[PDB]
Amino acid sequence: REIKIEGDLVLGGLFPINEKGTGTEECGRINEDRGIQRLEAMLFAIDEINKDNYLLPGVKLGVHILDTCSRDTYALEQSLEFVRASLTKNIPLLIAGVIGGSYSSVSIQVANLLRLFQIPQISYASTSAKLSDKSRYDYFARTVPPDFYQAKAMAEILRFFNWTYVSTVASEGDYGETGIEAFEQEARLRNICIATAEKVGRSNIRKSYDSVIRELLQKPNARVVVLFMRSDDSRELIAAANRVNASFTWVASDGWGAQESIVKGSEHVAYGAITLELASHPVRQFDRYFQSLNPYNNHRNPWFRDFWEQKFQCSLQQVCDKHLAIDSSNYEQESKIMFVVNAVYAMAHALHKMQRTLCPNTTKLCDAMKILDGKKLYKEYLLKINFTAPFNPNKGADSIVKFDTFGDGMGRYNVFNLQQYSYLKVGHWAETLSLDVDSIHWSRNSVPTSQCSDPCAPNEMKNMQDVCCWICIPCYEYLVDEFTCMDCGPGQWPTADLSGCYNLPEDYIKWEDAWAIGPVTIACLGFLCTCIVITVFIASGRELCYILLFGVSLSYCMTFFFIAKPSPVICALRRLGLGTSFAICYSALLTKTNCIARIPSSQVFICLGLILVQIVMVSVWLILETPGTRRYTLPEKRETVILKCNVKDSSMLISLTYDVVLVILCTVYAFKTRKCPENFNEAKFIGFTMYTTCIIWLAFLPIFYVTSSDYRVQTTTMCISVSLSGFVVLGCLFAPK
Template sequence: MSQPLVQMLVLLVSLHQLSVVSQSKAHSEREAVLIPGDIVLGGLFPVHEKGGASCGPNVYNRGVQRLEAMLFAVDQINKNKKILPGITLGVHILDTCGRDTYALNQSLHFVRASLSNLDINVLECADKSVPRVKKTASAGPIFGVIGGSYSSVSLQVANLLRLFHIPQISPASTAKALSDKTRFDYFARTVPPDTFQSIALVDVVKSANWSYVSTVYSEGSYGEYGIEVFTREATERNVCIAAAVKVPSAADDRMFDDIIQRLSKKPNARAVILFTRAEDARGILEAARRCNMSQPFQWLASDGWGRQIKLVEGLEDEAEGAITVELQSENIPGFDEYMASLTPESNRRNPWFSEYWEEAFSCVLRKKEFGVVGQTAIGQNSTVCPAKLRLTPETGYEQESKVQFVVDAVYAFALALHNLQRDVCTKTEGLCATMANYDRGMFYRNYLLNVSFTGESEITAY
């Protein structure tokens, strides 16, 4: 057996053991969106917020919208007879819970599903029988992966997927480190790196004539790389950093209170730059409320806060006057109508949609047989969800800012696959054997990185 293959299989066994040891019993971790197809794309989205060990109880609005954006795009492509004629796209979507180690374990499902692509001619059994790869529950071999969202997740997942030549496109990971093609040679993204928003934050600081500011950043690649660029650019432009505070990945209320106290010790630096994850930004605002400060801070935040309304719900006074930046994007035509058409009864392919519905409308779904839907029991003080509820602007729905980038990522895969089909399936309608077994590395380099198109938002994507 060849040495690289031995190393690959040893790594897989080791990671399998890791997944068994660290596997949680939470219900969300056993669920997936599985839609079979001739070609299957994997998906990794933070459907739930991170918890103490893995998944928290709360559904993450952004993550569910991004998951539905992938399903929406796949539906559109499968209906379009001009893209991948005779070929149906399927999906295998998993929840990362916003945690890098858990996402790594989840990605093993993609690796196992793709092991059927191994050339078994290089394997030899001791009893001379024909080697066989054990099948696992999946929608089929994974041709590529859409995700992750958090940069820390994408960094971990990309290191695993590259070993098995599985291309990956992230619609949200902006860490500068992911631009290093010597380390992440199967990774691409539909968003720009953090360098640009870090510089934009310094531009805002200078335009406001602030020369003395504090910074708060999340532990991990997103916060640490982003604030590094901001600090370097700010220093070069004569802006002094009063305090630089890191938010630990497992921060609790006490830690957030301590951060506010540290910032308060620099009374002349009322402007605070936040390069944090969404949950960390909310934790800081909650701590600011608990501290009941007489003089509020002026917040300037990255796209981790962005334009999320739910992040400041109940904390409007603490967030008043905040300036946040967001990546430029356009609403995807038809997606709002798609979301408005979904109900827990009609959207059975998304196993987390009932939880999302209950959280979005602060009500409890009624299940005919048991009086329970998802994990929420109907109690005396619970409000049962009215049957006529829909996800519309009137009920508080708003299209998430990175939906466009998810749709662009799916179309990038589909159009690259379409070009591959055109080149190698010249004598066959639909999926030919040459295309099904085409080397993923060559597909990434020759097709995926060279695709360009005008997306659903009418913005040209490369």
């Protein structure tokens, strides 16, 4: 019927004593664990409340308890009796609040009804996430944490120390549907991707056996399936996976819990699972009180007599004995009794603080408590209570009953693990994990990684991504990005860590590569040959020799000029040196050839001859200002980009053109060999060699310009000019000595 024991201030109680689904009446099959167990706990807490002298000395709390039959329709009809007394229209019971709850559907409906009439409601067990939406239930503060706190818990068991980052499984209804909706919002917001995310909806359907296959198909990035599914469906999935004989790490939810019956005959399939309980401490004072109850003593509860006729399979009025009593051998405590006493005390403490403030200096209630401020009672004292859970003498930091800003209890779960087969706690999610990692027995005897794409090394760092699945592309030029390569300084270039682009100074120089030594020997041989001639002969010929000697000296400088490192001005100056040296050598022959065909002072002719060489120098100087005396680097498709002076110097060939005309003009005077003195008096043997040397020098130059390596083409051409210069004098001075 109803428990309506009188008191100064009366509390409300809705417990699923009878069970829904019995048939036409639907209000049969009285439930013990969810029911009398919880019901007597609320009665037990009230007995302790009035016994205690510090909560409410002059206020003895009354009780108004009504059945819910585990059905919302019957709960709403019953719950009207709480409203009926208040808002005057015997039942003279000023119901301060109700401690109803249990099944979320039942608690949601009474939350809608009691919100309208401004009565605070505390649900001892309703882990639904919908009830935390205060825009619809603003008079509903509960002691148990919601289920979206499990989503925020499992999504942190996967991120402890480089843990798994994949896969998800759901279930239909509201538990699986709403919880997974929170799991995804906790995985996306903290960098976790998901694999196949099916939803096993009905009890026994072909989807479940296909669900394992659909999860087994996604093999590489799914070895941790995040179950968020109910107990009956969990059995169906595990048995389905048992038949296929697969292996996973079932990161489960409260639905799986710590029940051994979930995995029966399939323990090795689920070995290594991770599940979360609700982390409730059994009240030991109530355990003695509940076991001390007697059918002939319990008169306050009308259901106890019928309860005594149900749990013993006897008729109190099979015939059971008189000395039968509840004992720890028969049945144990309900896993949520702590949350019931923490809900009765959540009002007595709230009512005590309200009584002290609004009616001070009075042991009993004052006239202001004849009308109870529903809004003030909820969001001033009830929503701000901070006492410690009674009858739990451990008195740890977790033993508080602080209500959240949304009227939720403090989230506290127990991470479990099935190791061979029994459940043993290996963690505690209060606000951050405290997992005993060493004690965890994993599925495959080692910690799974469950990462889709392996991280890419400093080499092969380029990635084509979903987010957790990239492609390790073999291409650090600027640490351009994890996902791109424009290939300025790529892996196919001599780059460096995060820095190396084509800017690298890969200039190529010879620096005495063992080939330039020959030009020095050739220059030395010519100087020795020139010194012997000077000594053996020490006029027009003397002046010509001096001009020829200057050309020989210029050739040596050119060999050394090319040997020097590239410079914007040094390289350009050395380029003009080659033209001046060639003109000087050619000019002396022209001057010598012009003096022979003279049948007009010698000094004036010598000055005129110098004027012929000065014109090329003036043109050479003018040509230098044409490029601004700059140098151009030499990049290419390959590495080792060179940094030298100007390349493709067509003006250098233009300078040779003036020498070629002078050389061609010298051949005009070279045709007078039959008209010139032979073997004496300025013999033409040297002139013939000079003409041949010019052709050889011209041929050598085109060959070097034809190639692109430029190893020793410039040095080789200079050696020919240096060798040719000594050859003209050597051929003429063959008879002397």
